[PDB]
């Protein structure tokens, strides 16, 4: 039960979501909502170094 989360912006402010299973996450970044990417980290254990959902791999986790 990996879970995820998605930032618009690259900012210390901007709003941060997605926490949504890593699937709910594909769904999203393979769906189209994110054209540009988004800020893409994981929610447990949270730590930091964000990346891109076009530089992450979601064929490692679930």
């Given amino acids: 039960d990996v879970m995820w989360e998605y930032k618009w912006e690259n900012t210390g402010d901007a709003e941060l ?3 949504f ?12 909502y994110f054209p540009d990417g988004v800020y893409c980290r994981k929610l447990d254990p949270p730590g930091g170094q964000f ?4 530089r992450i791999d979601f ?3 679930t």
């Fill in 51 to 54: 990346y891109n959902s076009k």
């Fill in 21 to 32: 299973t890593s699937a709910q996450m594909q769904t999203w970044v393979s769906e189209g």
């Fill in 17 to 19: 979501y997605g926490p």
């Fill in 59 to 61: 064929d490692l986790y």
